[PDB]
Amino acid sequence: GAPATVTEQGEDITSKKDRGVLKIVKRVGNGEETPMIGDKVYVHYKGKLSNGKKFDSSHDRNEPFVFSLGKGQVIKAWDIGVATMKKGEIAHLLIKPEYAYGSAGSLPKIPSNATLFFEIELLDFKGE
C-alpha cells in the first residue's frame, strides 16, 4: 500500500539526498507561498509505523494539529516536509529513523529504528 508506493515513487526531499524523507503529492494545493521557519502551521494528519502496527490521527482528537515550523516541536522530517507543502495540499511522507526518532525510539508508541508514514493535509499557516 501507501508506504511501499512512497518507497518506489516518492521524491527525496532531503538536503543530503539520503532518502531519509520521501514525498508524494496526493492532492495539489494552491498559492505560491509555502511555510517558512517560525510560521504557525495547521494540519490534519494520519500517521503510522510503516509496518502498519500503530495508527495516530488528529481526527481522533476532533481538532487540527498545530505547531511552529523549525522550532524543534516536531520530528525533523515534518520541519523538512511541511516546508515544501502548499495550503490545501495532501502529501504522503515516508521517513527513515534518522529524521524521526532514531535508535532511541520513543516508547511506547515508537520503537527503535522505526520508519514512519504520514498523510498530511496542510490547512493553513501564519507568520510569526
Ligand SMILES: COc1cc2cc(c1OC)OC[C@@H](C)Cn1cc(nn1)CCCCOC(=O)[C@@H]1CCCCN1C(=O)[C@H]2C1CCCCC1
Ligand atoms: C512520540 O510521541 C508522539 C508521537 C506521535 C503522536 C503522539 C506522541 O506523543 C504521545 O501523540 C499525539 C497526541 C495523542 C498527543 N500529542 C503529542 C503531541 N501533540 N499531541 C506532540 C508530539 C510531538 C512528537 O510527534 C511528532 O513529532 C510527529 C509529527 C507530528 C504529529 C505526531 N508525530 C508522531 O510521531 C506521532 C506518532 C504516533 C505513532 C504512529 C506514528 C506517529
